[PDB]
């Protein structure tokens, strides 16, 4: 089948969503340094190196350890942690539950993934009263109580750490994890963050092909607006603020590449190229066999807004060494 | 473009998800009675009558009314409600917030449960990291006498807490925020076939219907969803599971919203694929309204996709010709 149909004008003017946060795509994010991504990322051979299906599944892990730290009574912090490779009930990969985010855990100034869930053991002594609570989710070493972010999956850990004090009944040392699929971003301090996850925070499995720059052609991510985690509320009115989240593909591209054979239409070293026409100016975007998108931004790391986009037109197959026009 | 690519073997062997619950598609659900659907439903002309984008958005409504009933001893039930038409920050439609489910509020029927909050800046309850379960749906009679509604004209959308608290919420008007994931409440988890039943689906004015046409009956896509219960939120699915249905694979909805299909099918035509099983095959068809059809007649038995071998396109054909059903 032809790759041409994988980008259309609606994908970039309101109907698209990034494959990491599921947020409406409103901008392109050049990455001149390059990056890698495998989770919920598909290539043109119909395969993924990640642990997630091309949907935003809820997170369920049957067995990790639970550790608790608290000096008083209302600040007891819960840390659930499992070795990678223990998500045995995930047909895609036992690296981590389907839907677990591919981001480093926050250790002791970057953005972290927050979701709402629970740590549960049938033998425990807590009663359910209809609530779930916010956790920081990520990959790590040193859990519990010496957490350091990790960005690889062999011999590392996945962590869920409660943001607020939890309630009494936390007896058991092992427990299951359940987290609703929606992710919001925790950031703090007076420092600014451009977007989350930064390339040095993205978790990949071994063999994951990287997206390295090729001349002035650099990989690009898709940016949307995501809620910030804060202490005013969970998310109503987005009053805790917003930031930009990024993903490697529009989820519509991920899904179609998992559903349909595109393996003949692209060789290594080739882009499928589209033209993005703006009011004044246009740029070309390319897709390579590994499922990564590219832009001709050279060193420019700044966001490209899609708010004035007129249309997307297919161009065709081009060598990846040919400069993608970048005339904005 | 041709509709042939909109169904492939992976869609029905693990990678498909229904457009209502986002559950992995494991079965086909014949609907002899027929049904309608508009929310997160797209047609081959690239348009929807619903209020939702082809994604599973979190739910956000800037102003409804909150009321409270309860003695005081962890008994206070919170009911939030707004008229349809007040979701004015939804560019798709002001009927209801993007992501609000198209199901009647519960008054052996399954209902939609999500985890969320009712928030007013002046409320006295401080935030400590939790959201709670609400039953969500369209209704009339809120707040005191909630009853399921199936249209958007003159009706309400409601969120009603399942568990009681004490005091802390007092402001009469407040915003609703609910996380996108829906689980299913049902007091008869043995007698609930699938959720929603055709008579529970909420549709907007103009929404085309899917009625039977000969032995051809409309079909829904079914997947396993978590039941809401009082053991926990969802860890291990220990509260049980149910069948949820949607009118389309989300991959189909999505592609119909992104790509022009408006010249590839006339009214009265199906695009037809063949589904091959061990010891039989059947045909599935898709009409220009975006509904799928099967030739199962008055049979409402669920067709399991466990033993599916492959999907192969067949081509355009009139909707009066019988979709073969040799299983």
């Amino acid at each position, epitope marked *: 089948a032809s790759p041409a149909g994988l980008l259309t004008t609606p994908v970039l003017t309101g109907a698209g969503s990034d494959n990491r946060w599921g947020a409406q795509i409103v901008a392109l994010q050049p990455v001149p340094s390059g990056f890698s991504t495998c989770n919920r990322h598909w290539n043109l051979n119909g395969s993924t190196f990640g642990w997630s299906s091309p949907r935003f599944s809820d997170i369920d892990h049957p067995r990790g350890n639970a550790s608790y730290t608290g000096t008083g009574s209302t600040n007891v912090i819960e840390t659930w942690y499992a070795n990678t490779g223990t998500a045995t009930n995930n047909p895609i990969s036992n690296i981590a539950p389907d839907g677990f985010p591919d981001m480093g855990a926050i250790g002791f100034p970057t953005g972290g993934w927050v979701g709402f869930g629970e740590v549960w053991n049938v033998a425990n002594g807590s009663p359910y009263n209809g609530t779930v609570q916010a956790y920081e989710l990520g990959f790590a070493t040193g859990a519990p109580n010496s957490i350091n972010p990790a960005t690889t999956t062999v011999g590392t850990q996945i962590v869920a750490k409660s943001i607020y004090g939890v309630a009494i009944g936390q007896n058991q040392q092992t427990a299951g994890l359940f987290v609703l699929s929606t992710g919001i971003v925790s950031t703090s301090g007076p420092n600014a963050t451009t977007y989350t996850p930064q390339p040095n925070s993205i978790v990949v499995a071994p063999g994951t092909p990287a997206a390295a720059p090729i001349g002035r052609n650099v990989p690009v991510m898709f940016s949307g607006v995501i809620r910030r985690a804060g202490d005013i509320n969970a998310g109503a009115g987005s009053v805790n603020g917003t930031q930009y989240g990024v993903g490697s593909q529009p989820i519509s591209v991920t899904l179609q590449l998992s559903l349909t054979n595109y393996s003949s239409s692209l060789q290594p070293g080739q882009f499928f190229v589209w033209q993005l026409n703006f009011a004044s100016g246009f740029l070309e975007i390319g897709l390579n066999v590994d499922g990564y998108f590219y832009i001709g931004a050279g060193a420019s790391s700044n966001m490209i807004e899609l708010t004035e986009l007129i249309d997307v037109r297919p161009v065709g197959v081009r060598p990846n060494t040919s400069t993608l026009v970048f005339n904005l | 473009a041709s509709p042939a690519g909109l169904l492939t073997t992976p869609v029905l062997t693990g990678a498909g998800s229904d457009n209502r619950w986002g559950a992995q598609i494991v079965a086909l659900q014949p609907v002899p009675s027929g049904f309608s659907t508009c929310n997160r439903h797209w047609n081959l002309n690239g*348009s929807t009558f619903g209020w939702s984008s082809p994604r599973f958005s979190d739910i956000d409504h800037p102003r409804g009314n909150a009321s409270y009933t309860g003695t005081g001893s962890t008994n206070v039930i919170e009911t939030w409600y707004a008229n349809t038409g007040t979701a004015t920050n939804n560019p798709i439609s002001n009927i209801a917030p993007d992501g609000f489910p198209d199901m009647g509020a519960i008054g052996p029927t399954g209902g939609w449960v999500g985890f969320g909050e009712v928030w007013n800046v002046a409320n006295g309850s401080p935030y400590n990291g939790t959201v709670q379960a609400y039953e969500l749906g369209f209704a009339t009679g809120a707040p005191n006498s909630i009853n399921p509604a199936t249209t958007t004209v003159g009706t309400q959308i409601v969120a009603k807490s399942i568990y009681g608290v004490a005091i802390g919420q007092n402001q009469q008007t407040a915003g609703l925020f609910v996380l996108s994931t829906g689980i299913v409440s049902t007091s008869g988890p043995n007698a609930t076939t699938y959720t929603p039943q055709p008579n529970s689906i909420v549709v907007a004015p103009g929404t085309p219907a899917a009625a039977p046409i000969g032995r051809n009956v409309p079909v829904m896509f079914s997947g396993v969803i978590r039941r809401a219960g009082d053991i926990n939120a969802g860890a291990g699915s220990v509260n049980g599971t149910q069948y949820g249905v949607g009118s389309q694979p989300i991959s189909v909805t999505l592609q119909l919203s992104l790509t022009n299909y408006s010249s590839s099918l006339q009214p009265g035509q199906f695009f037809v694929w063949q589904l091959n099983f061990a010891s039989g095959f059947l045909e599935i068809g898709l009409n220009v309204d975006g509904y799928f059809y099967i030739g199962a007649g008055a049979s409402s038995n669920m067709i399991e996709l466990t033993e599916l071998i492959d999907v192969r396109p067949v081509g355009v054909r009139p909707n009066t010709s019988t979709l073969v059903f040799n299983l």
Partner: nanobody
């Protein structure tokens, strides 16, 4: 879903018409809304979900395309008309085409 256009007729050069286009139901589409005229049909003017307007070169500066999503309606303000503008003008409402409204400009 059907379309209903209006505002077409015969006018001397320099005059002005207004074209209207109203879809029969309250639908939403991500496809852009546009006006086309007809040699072979050219794009007169277009507008996308993000409300950004794209004009043909021959009509630039004179025509203005506007939308009222609440009324399911797109407009074409035709000013400083010229005999080159005479054609059948078609509304494109996402993928829905309308039966053109005839526009003539005499010198």
């Amino acid at each position: 879903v059907q379309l209903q256009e209006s505002g077409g007729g015969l006018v001397q050069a320099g005059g002005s018409l207004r074209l209207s286009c109203t879809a029969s139901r309250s639908i939403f589409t991500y496809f852009g809304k546009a006006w086309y005229r007809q040699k072979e049909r050219e794009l007169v003017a277009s507008i996308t979900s993000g409300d950004t307007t794209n004009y043909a070169d021959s009509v630039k500066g004179r025509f203005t395309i506007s939308r009222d999503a609440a009324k399911n309606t797109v407009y074409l303000q035709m000013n400083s008309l010229k005999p080159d503008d005479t054609a059948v003008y078609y509304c494109k409402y996402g993928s829905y085409w309308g039966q053109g409204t005839q526009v003539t400009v005499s010198s």
